[PDB]
Amino acid sequence: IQRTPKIQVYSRHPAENGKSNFLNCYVSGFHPSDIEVDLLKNGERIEKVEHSDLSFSKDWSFYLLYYTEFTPTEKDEYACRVNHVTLSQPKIVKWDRDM
Amino acid sequence: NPDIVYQY
Amino acid sequence: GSHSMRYFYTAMSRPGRGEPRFIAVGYVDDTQFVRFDSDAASPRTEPRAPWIEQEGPEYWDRNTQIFKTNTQTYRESLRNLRGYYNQSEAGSHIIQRMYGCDLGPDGRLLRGHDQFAYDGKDYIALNEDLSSWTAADTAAQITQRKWEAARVAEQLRAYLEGLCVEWLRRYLENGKETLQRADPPKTHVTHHPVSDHEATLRCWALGFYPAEITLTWQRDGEDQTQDTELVETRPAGDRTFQKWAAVVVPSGEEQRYTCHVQHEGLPKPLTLRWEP
């Protein structure tokens, strides 16, 4: 009662244009456990997205990793869109290869 | 292996 | 090194949308090895790490039976807790349990754990003595009296000092190439000008296992705790973890800053600086 998710969007490996990698969206520190996470490519929902099994931290807050295979390029924009009961509107966090 | 120990 | 086994259970009610979902996950350190989900098309204990696959049919049947029994028990616990708090049947509630055992570098029991939460708030916990309880409120005192009457703490002590430790030691041996391999962080410092006057120095730690790491910035050998933006350690998705610490520094003063890295996989702690 109630904790908002922390969101990180990043790649599994150092980003190299034209080289296959994995785009991750890590949501953590949230409570309750219901959460909606989408990975976006140029504002469009990526359809094949996997996620980890629901687990939680010492403080009881939940965490999930959403991921998909992606080939970064100079022009493709990637993002993660998250909704939770604590959020009035979905939060979009853009992938920045420097973070 | 999990435990086999209850309702609250 | 030091190792632990933990099981994390989550039961969530959803009035009007069927019976409460029960999920259980098992971990050895930061490696998940089993899952059970009552919402799966065919609920069963499923392997999540390659070293657990060698367990025989009786293991998967026994674990499934336990988790299926837990699914029913936790739905009863949710009903009980709704009543202990005078809550309406309309809301959705969550019970969580964490339990397991910690071993020291010699493989000896360091301590056991068994604690519960209701709606993300501490509800009841087995004390370190594995014999007494700490209840957060008068509702948890009802559970404590029930568990004191049923000698629950005695059964948990037997498990935590016995089967928990034996199974953990077995998993550590079966998965020794990964579970007992610490992968050091691959570290580097990046420089990002923020303006003419300042730049961000970002110290990266990538590809490390286990998740525990220490990453700090010092300015003239003094910790910059209040000025460091430290992201939470995050999973890469290939078992490894990532982390970074960033400090905004005045232009020209970059060489006064040093990044310090401590990780189990590092023989000696690292000291890095920006290398233009």
Residue numbers in the entry:
A (entry chain B): 1 to 99
B (entry chain C): 1 to 5, 7 to 9
C (entry chain A): 1 to 276
Sentences from the paper on this structure:
The peptides are bound in the HLA antigen–binding cleft into six major pockets designated A through F. 9 Peptides are anchored to the cleft by two main anchor residues, the second residue at position 2 (P2) and the last residue of the peptide (PΩ), that bind into the B and F pocket, respectively. Currently, the classification of the HLA‐B35 family into two groups (PY and Px), in the context of HIV‐I infection, is based on their binding preference at the F pocket to specific C‐terminal anchor residues of the peptide (PΩ).
The alignment of the HLA‐B35–binding cleft sequences (amino acids 1–180) showed that HLA‐B*35:03 (Px group, Phe/Tyr116) differs from HLA‐B*35:01 (PY group, Ser116) by one amino acid at position 116, whereas HLA‐B*35:05 differs from HLA‐B*35:01 by three amino acids at positions 94, 95 and 97. 26 All three HLA‐B35 molecules successfully refolded, 18 showing that the presence of Phe116 in HLA‐B*35:03 does not abrogate the binding of NY9 that contains a PΩ‐Tyr, in line with previous studies, but in contrast to others. HLA‐B*35:01‐NY9 (PY) exhibited the highest thermal stability with a Tm (thermal melting temperature) of ~56°C, while the HLA‐B*35:03 (Px) exhibited a Tm of ~38°C, which is very low compared with other HLA‐B35 complexes. 30 This result is in line with the Px group molecules definition that does not favor a PΩ‐Tyr in the peptide, and so this is consistent with the classification of HLA‐B*35:03 within the Px group. While the NY9 peptide adopted the same conformation when presented by HLA‐B*35:01 and HLA‐B*35:05 (root‐mean‐square deviation of 0.14 Å), it was different in HLA‐B*35:03 (root‐mean‐square deviation of 0.35 Å). The electron density for the NY9 peptide presented by the HLA‐B*35:03 molecule was not well defined, especially its central part. This high mobility of the central part of the NY9 peptide was attributed to the large aromatic residue Phe116, compared with Ser116 in HLA‐B*35:01, that pushed the P9‐Tyr toward the C‐terminal part of the F pocket (by 2.2 Å for the P9‐Tyr hydroxyl group). The larger Phe116 of HLA‐B*35:03 is most likely favorable to the binding of a small residue at PΩ of the peptide instead of a tyrosine. Comparison of the HLA‐B*35:03‐NY9 and HLA‐B*35:01‐NY9 structures revealed the different conformation the peptide adopts owing to the high mobility of its central part when bound to HLA‐B*35:03.
